[PDB]
Each structure stands twice: as C-alpha cells, then as structure tokens.
Design an enzyme around this catalytic site. Sequence first.
Site, mmCIF file in Angstrom:
data_model
loop_
_atom_site.group_PDB
_atom_site.id
_atom_site.type_symbol
_atom_site.label_atom_id
_atom_site.label_comp_id
_atom_site.label_asym_id
_atom_site.label_seq_id
_atom_site.Cartn_x
_atom_site.Cartn_y
_atom_site.Cartn_z
ATOM 1 C CB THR A 79 -0.939 -0.009 1.207
ATOM 2 O OG1 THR A 79 -1.796 -1.155 1.140
ATOM 3 C CG2 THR A 79 -1.791 1.252 1.233
ATOM 4 C CG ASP A 372 3.557 -12.095 0.021
ATOM 5 O OD1 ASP A 372 3.748 -12.747 -1.028
ATOM 6 O OD2 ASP A 372 2.693 -11.199 0.117
#
Lengths: 506, 480, 64, 522
Positions: A79, A372
Amino acid sequence: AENARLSAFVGAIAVGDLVKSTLGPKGMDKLLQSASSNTCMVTNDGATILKSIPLDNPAAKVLVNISKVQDDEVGDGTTSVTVLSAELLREAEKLIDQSKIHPQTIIEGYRLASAAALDALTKAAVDNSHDKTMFREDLIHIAKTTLSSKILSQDKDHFAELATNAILRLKGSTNLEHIQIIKILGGKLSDSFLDEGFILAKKFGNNQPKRIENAKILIANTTLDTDKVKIFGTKFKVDSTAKLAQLEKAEREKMKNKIAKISKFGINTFINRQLIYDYPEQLFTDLGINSIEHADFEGVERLALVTGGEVVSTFDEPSKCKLGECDVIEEIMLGEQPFLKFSGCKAGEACTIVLRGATDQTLDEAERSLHDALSVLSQTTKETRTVLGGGCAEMVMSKAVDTEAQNIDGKKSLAVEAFARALRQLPTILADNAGFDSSELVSKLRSSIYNGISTSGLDLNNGTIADMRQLGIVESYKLKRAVVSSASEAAEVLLRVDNIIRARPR
Amino acid sequence: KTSRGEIIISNDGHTILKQMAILHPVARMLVEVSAAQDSEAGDGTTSVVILTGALLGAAERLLNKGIHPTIIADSFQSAAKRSVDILLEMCHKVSLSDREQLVRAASTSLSSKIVSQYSSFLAPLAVDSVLKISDENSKNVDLNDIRLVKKVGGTIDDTEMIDGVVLTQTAIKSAGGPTRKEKAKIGLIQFQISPPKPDTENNIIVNDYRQMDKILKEERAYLLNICKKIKKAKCNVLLIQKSILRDAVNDLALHFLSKLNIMVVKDIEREEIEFLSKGLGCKPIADIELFTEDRLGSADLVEEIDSDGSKIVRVTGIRNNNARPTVSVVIRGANNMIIDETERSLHDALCVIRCLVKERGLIAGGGAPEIEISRRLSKEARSMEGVQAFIWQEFASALEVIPTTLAENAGLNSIKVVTELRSKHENGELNDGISVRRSGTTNTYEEHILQPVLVSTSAITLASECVKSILRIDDIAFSR
Amino acid sequence: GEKISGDDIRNQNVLATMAVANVVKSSLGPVGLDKMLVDDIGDFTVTNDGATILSLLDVQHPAG
Amino acid sequence: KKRQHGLEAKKSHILAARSVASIIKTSLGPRGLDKILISPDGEITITNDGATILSQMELDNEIAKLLVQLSKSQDDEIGDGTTGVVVLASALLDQALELIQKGIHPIKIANGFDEAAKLAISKLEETCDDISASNDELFRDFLLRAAKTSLGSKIVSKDHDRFAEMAVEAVINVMDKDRKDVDFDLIKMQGRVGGSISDSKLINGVILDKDFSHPQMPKCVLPKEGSDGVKLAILTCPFEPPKPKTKHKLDISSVEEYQKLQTYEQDKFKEMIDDVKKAGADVVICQWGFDDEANHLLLQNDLPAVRWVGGQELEHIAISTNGRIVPRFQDLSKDKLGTCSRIYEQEFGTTKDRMLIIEQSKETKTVTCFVRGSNKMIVDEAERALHDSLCVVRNLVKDSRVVYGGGAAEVTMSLAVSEEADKQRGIDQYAFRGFAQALDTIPMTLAENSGLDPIGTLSTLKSKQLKEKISNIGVDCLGYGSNDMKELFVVDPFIGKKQQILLATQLCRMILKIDNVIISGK
C-alpha cells in the site's frame, strides 16, 4: 500544467486515501464488493484492491502495474508504494505551478534524490549472515515484522514457529512450489498443525485399508477412464456382436496386464491423473494398492515434490526412474471431509503447512501472508543485508536527502526538500491509522536520528518511541530496496505527462 | 419463496439465511456464520442463530465512544477466551455410554417445532442410532453412516429405525413375478447390463439376412451368460447403479431374471453404493470376470414394505460383520413439509450426542450461561481500569439480550424474569434457567433444558468471530 | 426481494384462504351443488370434489 | 396517507427528531460550530442557534412542531443560553427508547420522569447561592462574573470585553434600587454593517435610516440655545397643506375665488411653520412625507425634519424623551416637547445613507447598544446573543438564587435521584434512574466537542462531589484545566435550568403517549 495535469494529482491522492486505512499493522481491511456475480473479497493488499476498482484516471491504472511488481517481489505492505508516489504528486502541484519550475527539473530533483536514497539504504544496512544458529533464531523475530499486517495478528506467535520450521524442512529450497498450504474451514488460527508429510483432501477406495505402513507411492499421467482411446479417427469393423463383445472385454484384461506391470513394481499405493473405471479400481483392491484420481494438473505435481518420485507412463522397467516411500499413509479425517495424511517422507524435499480458520475470508487472505513470508526468508538467505523499519527508515533517508540538498543548493533544493517532506508524510500516514499524535511521534523520531540514534522508531502499540531491535522490527535490504527504488521511479513517469488524450470508446 | 417457486416453512436460521436475498454487502457475510454453525455445532440452530445479530446492539453503542475497532475486536477476543473457561467450570460430569442421560440431554433439541409431540418415539431412535454407530475412544463419528429415508405418507409414530440395509428405489415392477426374497445373496453391480456399445464408431457388416436375428441371438446369449453365472452363484438380489447415463438396460433382461427368480433394482447413486457396501459388507462387482461367491453377501430375509402405495425394500440380518456398519431410519410424514421439519429436527439430536462424545461436559442452558458469564465478566472488567473496563462491561450487558428476547417471545415480562435471574444468579448455584411451561425460573434439569459444552463453546466462538469480521471492514467500496 | 412483516401477512393469508373456501362451501351436505371451473385452456370439469378443484385452481398466495 | 401502528409510529417518530436534534449537537457550548441554512426564498442564514435554525427549517415529520412549540415558550420564559439549552431539550426522549425495549409501558415511562423531576430540583436548591444578599456594587461584580460565562456564547467571543460593558451598563439604566424589576421591551438593538466589531459603544436611543431632507443645511447640530433637551417633537397627523380628506367639490364662480385658492396654501405654509417656530422645537418628525414647498422654510426657520419614519420607532422616542407625540396641529404645545441630550448623523461609509442617531446621555427609558461590525452575517447573530442577556439579568432579578454552571448541576442531582430511586423500588427504580441517566448524557456531550474523555471527566465529578458537597466542580468546556468553577467565575441562573428542564419534561410526557399519526392536508 493546469488543464494538462488536473485529475492526475488529486485523483491519485483520492485513490491512496481509500487505502490509507489499510497501511500499517494497526490498519484495517477494505471490503471489495463486485457489481457482478454478487461476490465479495476482503483483502489488505492493494494488488487486488486496485485491480477490481474502476479507474477513470489513466494515471491510476499505471499504479496497478507498479503494484503488481511489488506484489510478486514483496507482496506485503504494498500500500505504501502507491501512497508514497501520491505524496510526490501533491508536492508537484506547488513547485510546478506556484514556484513555476519545469516538470523535468522537478523530475531531475527526484532523480538526484533517488541516487542519494540508494546510498542511505546500503550504508544503513545490517549484515546478518554466516552462522545459521543465531540467524534462524533471529528469523523468528524478523518474520514477525511483515508476518501479520492484518487484524489476525493473534496468530503471530503461533505461526512464528511454523514458518520457521517450514524453511528448516526445505533445507535451502527457494522454490515456493515446494511448500504446501492447506485451507480448512472451521476451528481457530491457533489450531494450525505442522507435520512432516502431505495431507490430501481426497480419500481412498471403498475396501482400501485405513492404515498402511511402509507403502510405496507411485504416480503417473495415464488415463484409466475406460477401454483404450488409441488414435484419432478409429472405428470397429466386425461381422456381428460376437467379436464386438470380445474386443470391449479383452481391453479390460489388456489394462489388467498394465496393472500386472504395476504389480511388478511392488508399490502399495497408486495415483492416477484422470478418473478410473470400476473394473481397474477393483483390480487395485485385489492387489492391495490404494488409488487416487481426479487430479487436473497440479494434483500429481504437488505430491511428486513431497514424495520425491517421478511420473512413470510406460510401467515397463521396475529398475530405473524413482520409487517413493512414506512411513504412514493412514487416512486421517479432519473437519468434515476426510483427508489423506502422509507421514515419514523419504527426504525433506518438500513440506506442508495446515491452516484452520472459521471464516473463509481469513483462509484466502492469510495464505498470502505465509506465501510472502517464505519469500522473505529466501531473500534473507540470499541477500545478507537487513535494515530497520517501523517509520525509522524514512527519517534516516531524510537525513541524507537534506544533506544532499545543501551541496546542490540552487532552486533544485525545493524539489529535493519536497522529496524529503514526502518521506516525512509516509510515517504520518503510517501513524494515522493508529490514531495517535503525529506531531509528537514524528518530532521525537526525526530529531533522535539527527542526534546519532538510528535504533529508535515509531511504536504504534504503546504510542511512543521504542527500540526497533527490542520489539523485533527488522526488514531485509531486498524488501527495502525494491519498494523505494520502484516507488521513486513510479511517480517519475507520472510527472512526464503534459497532455491527456482520451480515445473514443468502442 | 425462491426464484423457482420452492416453498420452505421453517424457523431454522441456517435454512432462512440460505435462500434469503440480501442487498447489503456486509450482511451477506452473515450467511457464512450460519454455515459454520451447522458444520461445527449443527444442533439447536434456532437458539444459536440469535448470536449472529446479538452483538450488533453492543457494537453500535461502542461506535459513539470513538474507540478504535481493533481495541473493540481484541477486547472481544479475550472476553471470548475467558467465557470458555467459565463454561468449563460449570459443566456436569456425564458418562460416555448411558441411557436416560442421552434421552434427557437430546430432548432439549428434540423439541422445537410442534412435531415435538411425536418426539417421544424419536428419542429411542436417536439414541440407538448413535449407540450402534460410535467408538469408546471419542472419534469424529461421521454422521454419513446414518441415512434419513424420506417417504410420503403415514405419521411420525410409524417412524422406525431399520437394523439392516434399506433401499429407497423400487424395481422396474413390469414383470413383478417374485413377491419376496429370503435366504438369498445380495450383490452389488457397479456395471450395467446392455448390448455392447463402445464409445467409438461401431460398424457391423451384415452380409446375410440370417445374421440380423443371429446378432439378436448373440445379444440374448451374451447378456444371459452373465445371468447364468449369477444363477450359479445363487444370487437373487442385484443392485445396479444409475441407468440413465449410457448403457441403461434392454427389455429382455426382465424375462431372463424372472425365469431365474432374481430381483433387480437400478437408478442407484454412486454415493449410495459406498454407504450400502459398509453396512452390508458385500464386495461390489465391477464385471462378470471378478464376479464370484466370495464377493457376494447374504441375508436372512428381505421384505418389501408397501404402505400408502409407497413400496420400500428392507433387508433383515447381516451375514459378514465388518468394522464399519451403517444404520438408517425411514421418516414417515404426511407431506414433504413435515418431512423437512423432521429432517432438521433429527439433525439436531445427532449433533447433540456427537458433541457429547468428543466432550463429555454438559452445562444447563436456557438463560443460565448468559447471566453467569456476564456476572464474572463485568466484575473482573471493573478491575481493568481502562478501555477494557468500558467494553467487557457493555459486552456483559449484551448477554442478557438473549433471555430478554426469550421472555418477550414467550409473552412474559422481560424485567420480571431478569429480576428473578439477577437476584438468584447473584450468589447462584446451577440449573437455574427460564421455564416456558411454568412461566418463571426453576430447575432446568427436570424441565429437560440443557446444551453441550462443546456446542456452547463453538457458539460463543463463532459469535466472537462474527463481530471480528464485521469490525474488520472499515470501508464499503464497490468494485468491478 | 419483497418482504412484509406484521399482521399484514396473516391477514392476507386468511382472507385468501377464506375466499377460496366459501366457493366450495356451496357443495356441503345432500343439498350441495356442483360448480364449473374455467381453465382457459379449453378443458373444464364440473364436480364438487375439493381434491381435484384445489389441484386445478391456481394458488395466488403461497400460503394457500 | 399511510397506515402506521405499533412500534412503527411509536419509535421512528421519536427516532426522527433524534437524528434531527443530533445535528445541532455539534453546536453545544462555546466550542460548537456554525451551520448554513438556505431559506425557501433563496436567502442564506448562517447561525449556530438551535432556536433560530429550527424556526426557519422546514422538515417532514410533525414532531418538528413539538420542538418549535417548546422554543416559543422558552423565549418568553427563560431563553438564556439557547445553544446550551436546546441540546438537553431532546435528551429526555433518547433514554425512553431503551425502556420500551425492556417492556416498560410508555405512560409509565412518562409518569416516572415527573416523579424524579421534583426531587432533582430540591437537590439543586442545596448548593445555590444568593447574590441579592450583597450590595449593589457586589451585585454588579456578580454580573461581570456572569457576563463572562453567560453572555459570551457564540462567535465574536474572541474579544468579550467590548460587549461586557454593553450588557452590564444596559440593565443599570433601567432597574430598581431594591434590585426587583425588569423591562426588556424598551431595549432594542439596531446594528449596522461597517467599521470593526470592536467599535461598538453605548448610545441610548434609536437609529433612523432616514436622514434630514433638503441637504441645504448641516448634517447635525450638537448644541441648542434653548437647552432643555433640544425640544424634541413628533407630529402624529401627516404633514400636508390642509385639505379635506373626504370627497368634496370646489365651485369657482369668479377669478377672485381662484386667486384665494392660491393664497390658501400660501397662508397655510406660513401658519404651519410659525406654530412650530413658536414652540421652538428643533426636532420635528413627520410620519408620512412632507410638503415640497415647506422643504425650504423648515431650514429657513432652522427646523430639521425627517420623512417616512416607522411607527414602532416613534413609540421608543416618546418614552425616551418623556414627551408626547403631537396628535393634532391645533393641539401643538410646549408641554408635549421632549428631551434629547445630543442628536447627530453617523458618517457610516463614504456616501451610502447617513443614519440619524438620537442619544440621551442621562437616564432614559430606551436603552440601546451601539453596534457596528465588518461581517454582515454576524449582525443578526450577535444581536440575538445580546438580546438573550436581557432575560439573563431578568433571571437574576426575579430569582435571587444562582448555581454554579459548567454542567455541574446535572451531576449533582444525579446522585440524589439514584438514591431516591431505591426508596420506591418496584419497576420505577430503573425508571427514576433512567431519568437521571438521560441527564448524565449532558456532561458526556460537553466533552465531546472539546476532545476530552466524556466518562473520564464525569467519573471525576461524582468522585469529587462525594467527599465535598460543593458544586463548584463541573465540566470544563473551554479547556481551562482544573474543573473548579469558582475561580473561573462560571455561574448559571437557578430559574434558568429549572424551567427549561421542567418544561421539557412536562412536554415529553405527552410526546411519548403518541401512538398513531394522522396527517391531513391544509
């Protein structure tokens, strides 16, 4: 400058303000409600958010491609990539218009700032390498940094031991296909189990035993569906049904000869890619061999890495190729549907992590967390340098950017200082979700680094300045370099737009 | 009323939310809550479903305080963990195998709909179903081993659990020669009896007019030779799978089996074969080559019950006893509406004892756990002195919404019941709850009001998980 | 969809069942008489038996 | 027409105004914010006043009339601190929604409020102080302490020292030496847009929009040779050459008769100016116009005059000058002459319209505050803010008891009603506590706009008032730190909180009794 770039600045900031609440470990998740199919998805990462949202601004669609770069390379905390570029567009609304500076000069100010930013990231990197004793133990705390950005953080300490033992079983495997993530409805996040083996969601046959020890597993790509498919454009020419009834029945015995070739291997378990007819399925019961079917593509591929076997199409030679062996293949029923639990693999070639959760939205979203996190563990093994996050890295770079501004001076210092001010807005936005004082926390962190203390950082749990080494906040140099270098060059292209050309819709 | 015109009348929370049309994005996720309640608990859905919207009133009151949702969500996480420990202290010691206790504990879930009048005969059927299929090691006890047979006609008083294999589908009935089958083998046929028709192109060259009828004679001989080995094995009962797929069956197979007095049935699902193979123990026959007498089972007598025009096949006795038997019960009702009412009623009783096998603890419900947890919570919440003091105390005030609704839904005054509850549960002992028949508070053990601890634990867990997902959404965005 | 709560459902259900019930009440007892139904498809059956009439009659509200 | 029964019109009807009254909730206290309301005619009125907004606002549900009907009586009764009081007026209907869910009958909810209302007032009578026990000097000092918290509410509160002497000196001119009297009728504030807000002064009189006609003389004559108040006079009858107003006809039979009609007005032109010059009245106000031929002779005889003056302002001039307006030209006499200390026309802007200002330096019946400001929108807002101050002093006159403000009253009576609820027991124990629970939302709402913990401040109030019975500890609105209201000079009238809470409780009794709503067109 005015009509040329209008929605390229405010429009991109309005997109970043929607995901502003998603930034940081204390942030919250946004609901994505699709106008079609009446489905929904809850995701923090902007890769799915920016992809499914309609974007009227062409500059906003460019932010999706740079998000996909950080999605594959990093995937967590992406983000701040588009938000950092949005702050550069806000400062460009002034220096280009108010201060009246050519956009390329503002870009050149960011070009020299990007070179100075790379020098601050390399010199401030901490080297953790060589002995894997303290290294693997540090990976527990290093992972917790980027492990959970969600509201699921209650599973941090639980998944910290599972993610650490996951790479331990891989023994240096950098392929993300060697790990198996299982999503199971019901239960709690603390109920996740980690064993050595693989757990399949399929089942055995009707008469197949529930427990088999020292079983030899062998897969294959063949098709047992029925008869023989042969080649294209065939047909049966017979005088009557006397020969036709024999041709159909004999091929059932011809497939049994292929099953007789399977019995020469001595395997206790067989796995087929496609469906199996009842007659060759019952022949596996007479030989006491388990059967697995209904694997489209990756069904046989995921099990080949765990068992370490090889696909045998011909079944000709019981010598060469590979024979996999598992200690206990026993079927273990978990939740509702029965599962096939394998244990005692021949080697550590692969590993499997089992996850359990009550909400289906938690299973799909937390899958990206461990996916991840293992990529980060592979980067810490390759790249030996790590840095410190938690708002401290932005103020350290601001010290180097402000230092370079004194050497350049001139009118470009307004663009260089604006790049430093853009780096000051990221921890402000980072601490905006926690709801604490920005002027109090930033001033204590910014002034402490100028005094020579690089170990401080923003603590959003207690709302004060704490040591990032004690709280266990550590970021690898590969993660930090990929975010800064891409976000600095992301807004570089957006500032090159002097005109807007709108094509006629189809 | 669905889009296709299906009419379903029930109070089940999972059934209503399944076909409910919801235009609100967040409220669509509430259906998943009812889906998890059926998989985890699966019993007392009418009582458990209130937890979906119970915390909505408490979460709305906390929005005006300006507290961050994570603080509110994390406070409910610790309050849920403390609520589980409170339920484990008040549980009752219950043996794994018993008689009156399983009838008394399940009777709470047995009585919801007006059909509870016939639940007197349902309790022996529900207890004996688990009594036959179970393990003393407290296994999962999959409910798939108990099949519910839906038959139209009769009354619930005629519902009886069969001790052996049952067949819902009937035979072709065209010939209908044999009226009974006794002391005969019952086979399982995974193939179909048809003239050979390979999937590839089939060209039969006929050079003579006599070859036509010769092909017919070959089709008669090839299909009869399969029945000859079946007659040699003395198997008068044959089970064929779904016949509408490919091969189906010819019209000459009836005269072949009728002459040999062999009963045949078709249109059987593949999942039904796996269920019947466990209880009967007969090895399925996938071809005539593997067909033998060792794979075939046996039975003492097979009787076909004909009631109200509906015929059903019943098998009495089992030859080979295996380690995975199966049982089934035939539900008799006036219409499919009552059958669906009994369907969800029997699902509750099976889940009650199933949770008792995994967790032997038992706690008295019906207003007892709501006040007891709220008393031990708000008392400890005042000692927090912080944001947790103004949340758990409000969450404890949300636990009395359930007995408040139970009082208003029963016609009794809410405060009049809570006043009796707050006064008695202040000190408190156990078993004190709301009695709808006596209109007041009395012992729930004699009133057959109970609930498993595993059910109450999974209920408060999914209730705490529901508010987490609601608070997890900080914004509403319409995507493409 | 269309959802209504309160006494409006029970009122419309009773008035719908009572309207179709008063039609078959004329056949009660030995003095009852048969009635005709218009199916609009060309078929008609004149009888007092409620088993066939209620099966032929189109039910408006699902409670009927 | 719609059919609503049951909880449909017994809840959403109350929930309607609940969402409407929550709009002005952000305007509570001096920390509040303003609002914009567009009139149906297209004009825009910007004010934070709860009574002004709800008066001109057009809503849908008929409950809006119940909120406006209360504000009509509040202006004639108290009307003090409207921004503060208007929020607590609707706080009684919010708590009643929780008692309905618990199963309490709506009438039992309404009857339970009046039972605890009489006991809450008796508790407030314990900590009240008597300001009338002191002298006139200490009474004016108590007004200065009150004018800080009470008078200043809305915007322009930046500098409160300019309007501090305006409200204090206004009630000093008209008052009784025993401190029992009030007149708010003769006090009218007419402001203008110009200069700065700090230029406001005290000028007793009226401000006329019409200046002296025939700009052939001086705009103002400050002194007078005759002294004795400049001899102000006002003619009630319109000033015109005398002619019969009724229908009549003239018959001219000769040229001489036409010539006499010429000298007719000529003889009356001198007769009207000499009767005024004989009385020596300098200020002569003509209600409707004047004669064009007489527009000179007035200046020739030094007789300043004006035209088109409203009858409302004429009533304030005659009572201020202690004179009588002249009803008839033949009734003109020196006994009806008024007394005016000084009269002048303000320069205002560059040209615009010069405003005639009548001023009396000595004691007069008409008290007026000279008001000028840069912003045009703040005119009506600042005037009505000081118009309520006339009733503020009135509450201190008629009621000698004064209580410490700052929300400390509702907290003081909260502990009393909580103890009195345990005496009745039954179902009224939660009903009486609910009435005090609704009053506990006032302190929590005060700290909402200031950014202070609502409960953290309220928990300290009841903890501090438990050890000491003094009510000086209250909610801090403006962020003064320590919550003692005695050092901050925060006081509120006793009758102010009394009636405004009591009349709101008496009205909510009939509001909760509404079941069905029947609306018919006009």
